[PDB]
Ligand binder design. Sequence first.
Ligand SMILES: Nc1nc2c(ncn2[C@@H]2O[C@H](COP(=O)(O)OP(=O)(O)OP(O)(O)=S)[C@@H](O)[C@H]2O)c(=O)[nH]1
Ligand SMILES: [Mg+2]
Length: 310
Amino acid sequence: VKLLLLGAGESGKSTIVKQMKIIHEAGYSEEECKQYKAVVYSNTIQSIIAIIRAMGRLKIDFGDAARADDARQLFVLAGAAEEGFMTAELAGVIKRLWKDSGVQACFNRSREYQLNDSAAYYLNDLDRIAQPNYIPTQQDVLRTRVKTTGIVETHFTFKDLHFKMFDVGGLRSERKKWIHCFEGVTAIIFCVALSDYDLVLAEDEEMNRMHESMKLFDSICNNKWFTDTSIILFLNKKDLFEEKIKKSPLTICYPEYAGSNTYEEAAAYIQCQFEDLNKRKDTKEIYTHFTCATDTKNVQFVFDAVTDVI
Ligand SMILES: Nc1nc2c(ncn2[C@@H]2O[C@H](COP(=O)(O)OP(=O)(O)OP(O)(O)=S)[C@@H](O)[C@H]2O)c(=O)[nH]1
Ligand SMILES: [Mg+2]
């Protein structure tokens, strides 16, 4: 069974691949967890730095003036983290910064810049991750963000079927590599980030993230090469969408949306926008699922349901 994961950048494709390891195998070993330690620290320092860069660009001041010296020390200290090291000194500098009112206000305006989804997860848990002899947990691994370049091939057995799952990069530079994967595809799992409706592309600040997705899906879904391939649509990041819909208008993306700022109502609407792109509704089926890629139980039951359809 050959499965292919497609979608724009940061839509959740690689996190689903990790889930297969945890569910069909036995999770990451201690040696493998320790390999992600430097990425966790790397992901965390980059996020605090991104918020600080933005405060200058957005003209936002710190809440307490004493933070300016912590922001000085951060850069003096920053380089050890990359090497998988986090002193109780660097930890306090980051912590005091993350807690600053000015920093927080900037954190709350992240759609104006580029910030990792897992910034809060890590930054809100510094005590644990800066610990002496810290080893990344299964959730810490799933939360790491590393751009995919090239093609990754993963194998696993499930219900007597041997899967060969392919994963590629969704950023614009990597899309030219999707065609090498187009052969013998049993099923395509197209990942779409529900929470991307109010953000812009990292590759272009003038392009809305959700519209980009619509373009990709319309193209893949309606490709004649895929007539006999199963199209599974994962409306991912349902957990972030749920919190986002409450304070960010969906009219930023879909100006004609007349419904309310609610999850069930707003979710079905995005579902219909995507399923609407299917040009041969009577002869072509799309199997849609709302997901939280970082939630093992959620992915388990969804993947279980997906393979039954296969
Ligand atoms: N909270 C939350 N975070 C998620 C979810 N799915 C993925 N993430 C986070 O989004 C980030 C990007 O996911 P990732 O799997 O790297 O995207 P990708 O599609 O593989 O991206 P690319 O390789 O084309 S650049 C990761 O830090 C990951 O933990 C989700 O449903 N909820
Ligand atoms: Mg990836």
